[PDB]
Design a protein around this motif. Sequence first.
Motif, PDB file in Angstrom:
ATOM      1  N   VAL A 146     -62.323   6.799  35.182  1.00 40.29           N
ATOM      2  CA  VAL A 146     -63.220   7.648  34.378  1.00 40.29           C
ATOM      3  C   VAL A 146     -64.605   7.409  34.868  1.00 40.29           C
ATOM      4  O   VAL A 146     -64.999   6.277  34.979  1.00 40.29           O
ATOM      5  CB  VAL A 146     -63.189   7.305  32.879  1.00 40.29           C
ATOM      6  CG1 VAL A 146     -64.307   8.012  32.111  1.00 40.29           C
ATOM      7  CG2 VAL A 146     -61.859   7.673  32.305  1.00 40.29           C
ATOM      8  N   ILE A 147     -65.339   8.476  35.151  1.00 40.02           N
ATOM      9  CA  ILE A 147     -66.735   8.357  35.501  1.00 40.02           C
ATOM     10  C   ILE A 147     -67.576   8.205  34.242  1.00 40.02           C
ATOM     11  O   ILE A 147     -67.480   9.046  33.298  1.00 40.02           O
ATOM     12  CB  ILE A 147     -67.211   9.560  36.308  1.00 40.02           C
ATOM     13  CG1 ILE A 147     -66.694   9.498  37.758  1.00 40.02           C
ATOM     14  CG2 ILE A 147     -68.715   9.627  36.299  1.00 40.02           C
ATOM     15  CD1 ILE A 147     -65.182   9.856  37.928  1.00 40.02           C
ATOM     16  N   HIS A 207     -72.218  17.312  40.985  1.00 37.44           N
ATOM     17  CA  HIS A 207     -70.830  16.843  40.953  1.00 37.44           C
ATOM     18  C   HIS A 207     -70.631  15.532  40.203  1.00 37.44           C
ATOM     19  O   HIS A 207     -69.521  15.260  39.750  1.00 37.44           O
ATOM     20  CB  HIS A 207     -70.206  16.716  42.339  1.00 37.44           C
ATOM     21  CG  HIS A 207     -70.934  15.809  43.293  1.00 37.44           C
ATOM     22  ND1 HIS A 207     -71.922  16.264  44.148  1.00 37.44           N
ATOM     23  CD2 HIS A 207     -70.744  14.505  43.602  1.00 37.44           C
ATOM     24  CE1 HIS A 207     -72.327  15.272  44.919  1.00 37.44           C
ATOM     25  NE2 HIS A 207     -71.634  14.193  44.604  1.00 37.44           N
ATOM     26  N   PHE A 240     -70.558  16.575  36.631  1.00 35.42           N
ATOM     27  CA  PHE A 240     -69.295  17.240  36.397  1.00 35.42           C
ATOM     28  C   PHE A 240     -68.212  16.201  36.348  1.00 35.42           C
ATOM     29  O   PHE A 240     -67.302  16.305  35.564  1.00 35.42           O
ATOM     30  CB  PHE A 240     -68.992  18.256  37.498  1.00 35.42           C
ATOM     31  CG  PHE A 240     -67.639  18.867  37.386  1.00 35.42           C
ATOM     32  CD1 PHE A 240     -67.417  19.918  36.511  1.00 35.42           C
ATOM     33  CD2 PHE A 240     -66.579  18.381  38.146  1.00 35.42           C
ATOM     34  CE1 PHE A 240     -66.148  20.490  36.382  1.00 35.42           C
ATOM     35  CE2 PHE A 240     -65.326  18.932  38.048  1.00 35.42           C
ATOM     36  CZ  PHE A 240     -65.104  19.997  37.148  1.00 35.42           C
ATOM     37  N   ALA A 241     -68.302  15.194  37.191  1.00 34.63           N
ATOM     38  CA  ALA A 241     -67.262  14.192  37.210  1.00 34.63           C
ATOM     39  C   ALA A 241     -67.217  13.470  35.860  1.00 34.63           C
ATOM     40  O   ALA A 241     -66.133  13.176  35.332  1.00 34.63           O
ATOM     41  CB  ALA A 241     -67.450  13.221  38.382  1.00 34.63           C
ATOM     42  N   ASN A 274     -65.574  16.032  33.265  1.00 37.12           N
ATOM     43  CA  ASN A 274     -64.244  16.439  33.649  1.00 37.12           C
ATOM     44  C   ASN A 274     -63.387  15.229  33.385  1.00 37.12           C
ATOM     45  O   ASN A 274     -62.328  15.357  32.794  1.00 37.12           O
ATOM     46  CB  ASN A 274     -64.249  16.841  35.140  1.00 37.12           C
ATOM     47  CG  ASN A 274     -62.964  17.535  35.611  1.00 37.12           C
ATOM     48  OD1 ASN A 274     -62.418  18.367  34.918  1.00 37.12           O
ATOM     49  ND2 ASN A 274     -62.526  17.232  36.848  1.00 37.12           N
ATOM     50  N   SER A 275     -63.853  14.039  33.763  1.00 35.94           N
ATOM     51  CA  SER A 275     -62.965  12.885  33.715  1.00 35.94           C
ATOM     52  C   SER A 275     -62.783  12.490  32.258  1.00 35.94           C
ATOM     53  O   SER A 275     -61.749  11.941  31.859  1.00 35.94           O
ATOM     54  CB  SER A 275     -63.450  11.723  34.614  1.00 35.94           C
ATOM     55  OG  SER A 275     -64.710  11.197  34.237  1.00 35.94           O
ATOM     56  N   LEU A 300     -54.274  17.767  33.653  1.00 37.49           N
ATOM     57  CA  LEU A 300     -55.073  18.209  34.803  1.00 37.49           C
ATOM     58  C   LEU A 300     -55.994  19.332  34.384  1.00 37.49           C
ATOM     59  O   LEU A 300     -55.685  20.111  33.464  1.00 37.49           O
ATOM     60  CB  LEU A 300     -54.186  18.709  35.923  1.00 37.49           C
ATOM     61  CG  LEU A 300     -53.043  17.789  36.303  1.00 37.49           C
ATOM     62  CD1 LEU A 300     -51.998  18.485  37.141  1.00 37.49           C
ATOM     63  CD2 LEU A 300     -53.624  16.636  37.040  1.00 37.49           C
ATOM     64  N   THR A 301     -57.130  19.424  35.054  1.00 37.97           N
ATOM     65  CA  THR A 301     -58.053  20.462  34.735  1.00 37.97           C
ATOM     66  C   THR A 301     -57.581  21.681  35.466  1.00 37.97           C
ATOM     67  O   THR A 301     -57.360  21.623  36.672  1.00 37.97           O
ATOM     68  CB  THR A 301     -59.438  20.090  35.150  1.00 37.97           C
ATOM     69  OG1 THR A 301     -59.784  18.891  34.463  1.00 37.97           O
ATOM     70  CG2 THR A 301     -60.443  21.188  34.788  1.00 37.97           C
ATOM     71  N   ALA A 302     -57.387  22.763  34.710  1.00 43.42           N
ATOM     72  CA  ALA A 302     -56.938  24.043  35.234  1.00 43.42           C
ATOM     73  C   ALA A 302     -58.171  24.852  35.582  1.00 43.42           C
ATOM     74  O   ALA A 302     -58.258  25.437  36.667  1.00 43.42           O
ATOM     75  CB  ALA A 302     -56.092  24.781  34.212  1.00 43.42           C
ATOM     76  N   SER A 303     -59.151  24.866  34.686  1.00 48.07           N
ATOM     77  CA  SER A 303     -60.346  25.647  34.942  1.00 48.07           C
ATOM     78  C   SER A 303     -61.500  25.169  34.109  1.00 48.07           C
ATOM     79  O   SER A 303     -61.311  24.520  33.061  1.00 48.07           O
ATOM     80  CB  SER A 303     -60.075  27.088  34.602  1.00 48.07           C
ATOM     81  OG  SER A 303     -59.644  27.177  33.250  1.00 48.07           O
ATOM     82  N   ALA A 304     -62.692  25.532  34.564  1.00 51.27           N
ATOM     83  CA  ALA A 304     -63.894  25.199  33.838  1.00 51.27           C
ATOM     84  C   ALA A 304     -64.995  26.230  33.983  1.00 51.27           C
ATOM     85  O   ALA A 304     -65.155  26.839  35.038  1.00 51.27           O
ATOM     86  CB  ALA A 304     -64.384  23.867  34.266  1.00 51.27           C
ATOM     87  N   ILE A 308     -69.061  25.970  33.535  1.00 49.24           N
ATOM     88  CA  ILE A 308     -70.057  24.952  33.408  1.00 49.24           C
ATOM     89  C   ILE A 308     -71.476  25.507  33.589  1.00 49.24           C
ATOM     90  O   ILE A 308     -71.701  26.540  34.240  1.00 49.24           O
ATOM     91  CB  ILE A 308     -69.741  23.773  34.387  1.00 49.24           C
ATOM     92  CG1 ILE A 308     -69.902  24.194  35.858  1.00 49.24           C
ATOM     93  CG2 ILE A 308     -68.335  23.230  34.123  1.00 49.24           C
ATOM     94  CD1 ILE A 308     -69.615  23.116  36.827  1.00 49.24           C
TER      95      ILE A 308
END
Lengths: 143, 143
Positions: B31-32, B65, B68-69, B72-73, B85-89, B91
């Motif tokens: 995890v970020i 990024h 985003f990381a 997302n994480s 899992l990420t399918a879409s975003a 942002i």
Amino acid sequence: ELSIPELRERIKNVAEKTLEDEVKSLSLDEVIGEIIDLELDDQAISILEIKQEHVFSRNQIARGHHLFAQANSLAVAVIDDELALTASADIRFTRQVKQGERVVAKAKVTAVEKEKGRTVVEVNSYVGEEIVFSGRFDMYRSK
Amino acid sequence: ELSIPELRERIKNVAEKTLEDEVKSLSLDEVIGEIIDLELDDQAISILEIKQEHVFSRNQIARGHHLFAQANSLAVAVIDDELALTASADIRFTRQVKQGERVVAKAKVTAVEKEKGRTVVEVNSYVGEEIVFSGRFDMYRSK
């Protein structure tokens, strides 16, 4: 003792053999993935090799943020301006990328507006011949 | 009051709810940002300090990024599933973050969607109390 025109005209020439313009928006270091083609305000291609350090430990699936970093940093580098910043993006993760694969990202600049400060870049990324990622990116620009 | 048999009964039960509440979708080093709070299928919070390597050398701005990381994480971490899992975003980068800022990412699970059964996680990140990033993530799982 060689002039700034004729020097710059040699960049034009190197750029026609390498298919890669001089980048204005970030240092080359700073793009994720290796630039293959870079034609400013127009199109660019990069290729990222998914190594162990890019992938989750349970299953060697690539983290979404490296796929994004690749696309994002490309949509930055295409912009012909010393300052481009991502305003928004809308992105789809369509096929899991596995460790060991090379992701080839393809940016098209699909709308400029130097006037109202902005520019749209579409990136699609492939593993061989399959889309694994696509996004639209709203870029900001100007200095 | 109570004996060491019964006190330990209680401890094993709580030790088990702690396992039930731990992250399942990735491991924490993946995890970020440092997680401050995590309540599965519900909300979570992570802070990330923006160090030199998170940042353009031109002007000490954080790379999108990394922002985003973080989000997302964290959108992955809140999902109660071995696989998510990420399918879409969608942002939005709402404000430049400069190196030396801490970014607090606040993620709430806002819906599950009847078509292609996704979990929708919204995430907004602040520096101070002003938004530097927001995103709507459609996550996939095994349910």
